């Protein structure tokens, strides 16, 4: 416990009169240290479509996918850029599967698996739609939910299809994989998120999450609380460990396009022109219920921790850097990294992921993970069963 | 990726990241190599029809042999596929499953045709000349390199008039 | 004959704001983002020139006029275009003109 060398950043009001959420990002960029203040990027690439964002599980490479033709893998911290592909088919998402050397893009029809340089490795005959393209490196399993009812699991270690699960739910409106559990979460128009394992052809458990369609879903690091948003201007705080929505934030001004969860407990809600993050909102009490406005400054009622409004955009998606305190918000013209104080964890474990990794360390670690892949039957509702 | 060890090899028995069985040996790319098609999906635009040839060629082989519709419709298939030149011969019926390749329909492509006629030195130089707007098929200058040209249209490809590459030859 | 951006050979000079880094800004396949499945379905065979259907050029339609004839009487000429039959005439002031409208 005392070996833990680095401690989180904080944000403190210092008055009741002074307010926490009112800080702006140019105002933040004054006091943050120079490399960390400079780690906020403004990539306005206004020519192509709205931009999809994903950092790798280590923050070392950023992958972006504009809706029209852009596919871009930068070695994000440095000036290096690996991939810049212009496919005139339209794309939806992308993820690095194992390392920055191999990634996968979610196109109009077919998923593509791709080299760092931008070369074509593997076009999938299957995956005939691809809306959410997500990965779990602990099974080496690219799990993809298109606009189809089905859900496809490709084991890119072997390079073969594991399984394909028809939901009977229709087009997938959301998918968030569980880091702690590797159960997949699919969200559809009935207000229903289904938990999934590749073995079980019926879902593990269905959840009538909200009314209307599922806008998005996002899961804790601990796998305890998953924050779900419907298109009904509502966001539920599901505690998966006992399958209860802790708080039901009703009547947003606009339904959130996405939700995202940091490591230390931050929650990101992006209505699209606005991005708003709460601190410690996932806890058990309804005092920790995330609320927009606490009248009278009552400590029980909970205000948002950090706010932002995008002027000329309706942003697409967002994702924290997993070890740093920023979050990449993909807007129509591009990418902002909005600086949080305490979102990411300060003390990573190198033996799990390496944010500072040599290429020789990388090819050691890749072989280490491929030795430690699990075959797909081990995806279960509990890791420990 | 690693020239991995004798002890690594036996544990990672079935894995690969370069040649997959769903990736079908990267066979399509070897045709995308030899004919230099711009988009990937042109291959699968031929191969989605190419099985559709065989899917009619197979079930017309399932009819009784001297079914007078069967020998007539197969002749109507073969005169059609012989007008487009995607098979060399028409006497045998067996080319409808053996000769119908993506490469055979893809050697009825336009720069393959000019590359046969030695107006161009290589294949991609003919593609560059179509892109430059130097070529025409009878009446029309064609901009598209991916032109399906029939056997009977093959005499109609000339250089376009007043050019800088028709005066080159 | 016709001044249409979606018709292909209409414009003399193309707008350089659409000429992006690699490619046109319009030559990107935008049919894959339709809400409907049928409009997202692509059936376009690659190199079809004036073939069967509109969707299978994988292109914009060329502005072309096939057939041209004169009227005998009033020197009117009609040409069947890509858009359809157009009529030019000398039957001037058939433009209907309401007068003194409340």
């Amino acid at each position: 416990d005392y070996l833990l060398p680095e401690s989180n950043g904080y944000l403190e009001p210092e008055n009741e009169l002074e307010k926490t959420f009112k800080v702006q990002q140019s105002e933040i960029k004054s006091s943050v240290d120079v490399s960390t203040a400079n780690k906020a990027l403004d990539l306005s690439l206004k020519e192509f479509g709205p931009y999809h964002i994903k950092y790798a599980k280590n923050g070392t490479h950023l992958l972006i996918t504009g809706r029209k033709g852009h596919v871009a893998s930068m070695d994000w911290r440095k000036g290096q850029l690996r991939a810049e592909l212009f496919l005139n088919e339209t794309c939806h998402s992308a993820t690095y599967l194992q390392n920055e050397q191999y990634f996968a893009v979610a196109q109009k029809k077919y998923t593509f698996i791709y080299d760092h340089e931008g070369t074509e490795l593997h076009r999938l005959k299957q995956h005939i739609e691809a809306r959410h393209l997500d990965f779990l490196p602990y099974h080496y399993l690219l799990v993809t939910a298109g606009e189809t009812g089905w859900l496809k699991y490709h084991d890119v270690s072997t390079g073969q299809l594991v399984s394909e699960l028809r939901t009977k739910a229709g087009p997938t409106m959301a998918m968030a994989q569980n880091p702690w559990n590797a159960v997949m979460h699919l969200g559809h128009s009935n207000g229903t998120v289904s938990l999934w394992s590749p073995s079980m052809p019926e879902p593990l458990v269905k959840l009538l999450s909200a009314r209307g369609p599922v806008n998005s879903i996002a899961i804790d690091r601990s796998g305890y609380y998953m924050a779900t948003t419907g298109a009904d201007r509502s966001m539920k705080i599901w505690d998966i460990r006992n399958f209860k929505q802790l708080h039901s934030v009703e009547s947003l001004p606009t339904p959130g396009t996405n939700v995202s969860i940091s490591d230390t407990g931050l929650l990101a809600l992006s209505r699209g022109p606005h991005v708003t993050l709460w601190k410690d909102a996932l806890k058990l009490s309804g005092d920790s219920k995330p609320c927009f406005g606490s009248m009278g400054g009552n400590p029980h009622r909970n205000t948002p921790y950090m706010s932002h409004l995008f002027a000329g955009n309706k942003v697409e998606n967002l994702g924290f850097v997993p070890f740093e305190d920023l979050l990449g918000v993909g807007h129509q013209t591009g990418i902002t990294n909005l600086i949080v104080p305490g979102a990411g964890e300060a003390n990573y474990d190198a033996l799990e992921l390496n944010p500072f990794e040599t290429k020789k360390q990388r090819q050691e670690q890749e072989v280490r993970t491929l030795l430690n892949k699990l075959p797909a039957d081990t995806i279960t509702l509990d890791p420990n069963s | 990726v690693r020239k991995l060890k004798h002890h690594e090899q036996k544990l990672l028995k079935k894995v690969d990241f370069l040649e997959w069985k769903q990736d079908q040996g990267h066979r399509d790319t070897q045709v995308m190599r030899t004919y230099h098609i711009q988009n990937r999906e042109d291959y699968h635009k031929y191969n989605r029809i190419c099985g559709d040839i065989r899917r009619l060629a197979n079930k017309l082989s399932l009819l009784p042999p001297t079914d007078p519709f069967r020998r007539k419709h197969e002749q109507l298939l073969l005169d059609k596929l012989y007008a487009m030149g995607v098979l060399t011969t028409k006497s045998k019926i067996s080319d409808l499953e053996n000769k119908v390749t993506v490469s055979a329909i893809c050697r009825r492509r336009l720069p393959v045709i000019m590359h046969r006629l030695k107006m161009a030195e290589t294949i991609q130089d003919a593609v560059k000349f179509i892109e430059q707007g130097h070529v025409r098929v009878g009446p029309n200058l064609i901009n598209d390199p991916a032109y399906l040209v029939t056997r009977n249209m093959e005499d109609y490809v000339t250089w376009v008039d007043n050019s800088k590459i028709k005066k080159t030859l | 004959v016709s001044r249409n951006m979606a018709l292909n050979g209409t414009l003399e000079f193309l707008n350089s704001k659409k000429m992006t880094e690699a490619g046109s800004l319009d030559l990107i396949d935008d049919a894959g983002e339709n809400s409907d499945l049928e409009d997202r379905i692509d059936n376009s065979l690659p190199g079809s020139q004036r073939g069967g259907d509109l969707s299978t050029r994988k292109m914009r339609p060329e502005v072309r006029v096939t057939s041209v004839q004169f009227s005998p009487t009033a020197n009117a000429f009609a040409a069947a275009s890509t858009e359809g039959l157009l009529i030019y005439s000398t039957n001037d002031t058939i433009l209907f003109d309401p007068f003194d409208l409340d």
């Binding site: 931008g118 074509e120 | 370069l18 790319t29 190599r33 711009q38 990937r40 892109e131 430059q132 390199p145 | -």
Partner: peptide, 25 residues
């Protein structure tokens, strides 16, 4: 100023050394 015949460069089966059939020479 883009070169003509902008083609999809993809996996070369006869040139990529990542292939173990071309791991020999």
């Amino acid at each position: 100023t883009r070169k003509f015949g902008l083609v999809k460069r993809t996996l070369n089966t006869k040139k990529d050394q990542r292939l173990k059939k071309n791991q020999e020479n």
